[PDB]
Amino acid sequence: KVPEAAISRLITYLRILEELEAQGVHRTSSEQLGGLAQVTAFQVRKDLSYFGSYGTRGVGYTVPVLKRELRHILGLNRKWGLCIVGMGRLGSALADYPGFGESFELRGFFDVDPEKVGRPVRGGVIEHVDLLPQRVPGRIEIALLTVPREAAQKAADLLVAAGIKGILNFAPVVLEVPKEVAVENVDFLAGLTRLSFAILNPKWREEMMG
Amino acid sequence: MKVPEAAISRLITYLRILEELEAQGVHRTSSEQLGGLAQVTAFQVRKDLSYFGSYGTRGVGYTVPVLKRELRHILGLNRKWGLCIVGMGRLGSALADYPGFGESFELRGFFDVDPEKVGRPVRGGVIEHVDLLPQRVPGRIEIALLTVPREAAQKAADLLVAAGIKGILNFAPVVLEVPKEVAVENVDFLAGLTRLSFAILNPKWREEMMG
Ligand SMILES: NC(=O)c1ccc[n+]([C@@H]2O[C@H](COP(=O)([O-])OP(=O)(O)OC[C@H]3O[C@@H](n4cnc5c(N)ncnc54)[C@H](O)[C@@H]3O)[C@@H](O)[C@H]2O)c1
Ligand SMILES: NC(=O)c1ccc[n+]([C@@H]2O[C@H](COP(=O)([O-])OP(=O)(O)OC[C@H]3O[C@@H](n4cnc5c(N)ncnc54)[C@H](O)[C@@H]3O)[C@@H](O)[C@H]2O)c1
Ligand SMILES: [Cl-]
Numbered sequence: 091k092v093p094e095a096a097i098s099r100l101i102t103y104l105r106i107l108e109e110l111e112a113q114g115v116h117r118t119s120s121e122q123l124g125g126l127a128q129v130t131a132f133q134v135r136k137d138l139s140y141f142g143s144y145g146t147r148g149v150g151y152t153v154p155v156l157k158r159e160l161r162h163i164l165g166l167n168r169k170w171g172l173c174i175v176g177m178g179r180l181g182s183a184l185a186d187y188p189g190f191g192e193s194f195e196l197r198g199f200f201d202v203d204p205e206k207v208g209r210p211v212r213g214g215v216i217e218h219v220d221l222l223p224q225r226v227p228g229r230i231e232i233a234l235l236t237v238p239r240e241a242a243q244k245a246a247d248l249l250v251a252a253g254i255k256g257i258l259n260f261a262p263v264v265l266e267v268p269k270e271v272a273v274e275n276v277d278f279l280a281g282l283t284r285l286s287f288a289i290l291n292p293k294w295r296e297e298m299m300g
Numbered sequence: 301m302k303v304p305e306a307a308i309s310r311l312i313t314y315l316r317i318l319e320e321l322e323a324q325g326v327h328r329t330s331s332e333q334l335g336g337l338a339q340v341t342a343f344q345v346r347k348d349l350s351y352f353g354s355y356g357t358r359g360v361g362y363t364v365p366v367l368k369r370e371l372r373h374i375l376g377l378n379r380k381w382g383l384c385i386v387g388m389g390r391l392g393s394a395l396a397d398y399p400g401f402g403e404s405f406e407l408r409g410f411f412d413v414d415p416e417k418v419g420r421p422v423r424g425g426v427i428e429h430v431d432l433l434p435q436r437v438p439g440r441i442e443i444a445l446l447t448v449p450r451e452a453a454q455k456a457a458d459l460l461v462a463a464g465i466k467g468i469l470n471f472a473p474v475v476l477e478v479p480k481e482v483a484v485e486n487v488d489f490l491a492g493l494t495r496l497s498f499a500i501l502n503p504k505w506r507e508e509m510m511g
Contacts, residue, residue: 281485
């Protein structure tokens, strides 16, 4: 059970903590945090406790300490090895996308099409998907799955067999994998829907909900 | 730096849940069951659905198909929106073939500036030059999927605003400048990475038994 909204909130707090530290703030109250995140101080205290970081009432959280805890629980203090499986149009575009950060490093690009295998790409070369078992163990923990839906489950079974630990699934299907293998499905439909709502209600803001 | 607006995201979550509860033959549900499946307190569910008018009375719960139709109306999904893709490169072309838009969103235009792309056939049409926006958008296309390189994003957006776009789903890694009259949502396909690292390191997160 992955608390998606809570996590997105933690990442927000982390980003705020990074700036607070840069600005020379050693301790920050749930009030200051909520103010910057635009969330109730009560909610901030709740999220932090929800994740194990309890407050020091009237004193505030120690910025560098809290920042470190958030980085640790989120796994951002590690260097994760990733690969893209399915170097088609979406997969190739992702290989060039500059949003991975230092915590996530692409170390493999795979495909089943021999016309693509051998093609150089940013930071590597496309290898045949049949090499997963020779490339994943001890090097790649997360795979970006960008193959057509018709082959997604099969590609996932191969990833699982090769030792993958997590799959960022772009194919529009629900994958079946052992419980030990994490999977997150990505889509832009929620964003499209938020646009839909916003276009129909241009002046609405959630604060109106109180 | 602020947490993005979440209320609408919660409604979208409830709708996914309801779609699956409905798939499971479930005909009736509760704020408690919904709250659990969406990982939000029963209280938050009631407060949300009350505010948007789908709440009945304390204890009556909800009728899955009724509530689903209501959430769809509120979200604007019972409408058919016209979309376009601006920037028919790799991501843009993948999007033109994405099979999950559904009935609510219908692609009606594909634009680029590359003469080698313009005139090329694609699912449902042909790639046209971005200069055609002013004569293609009005009354036919309300939402634009922006998939041009970062460096060209703002000016592409300016052109969209000028042509009459109402909303932009921005995939370019940059913050756009647009009048408050035009809604904007930025996509981040890599947001899930941190949810996976979290999941991989906390495999039994909050379970009844983690040992
Ligand atoms: N989640 C989203 O928002 C989103 C938006 C874009 C597209 N889609 C999905 O992204 C996926 C890729 O779309 P695309 O337009 O790039 O498709 P594509 O046809 O351009 O590319 C798919 C690539 O997968 C490779 N492939 C097929 N089977 C394979 C296997 N078993 N192992 C390894 N590689 C294999 C092909 O050779 C090809 O290069 C599809 O499932 C598509 O529907 C999702
Ligand atoms: N949000 C995400 O998760 C995500 C992941 C994929 C890539 N990216 C972004 O998606 C965008 C597209 O990436 P790509 O790999 O497909 O790029 P690409 O270079 O393959 O294609 C870009 C296309 O934009 C067209 N273009 C340039 N200026 C234009 C203009 N003014 N009007 C219309 N078309 C124009 C080009 O002619 C080209 O066909 C980039 O900004 C990239 O960083 C985002
Ligand atoms: Cl989202």
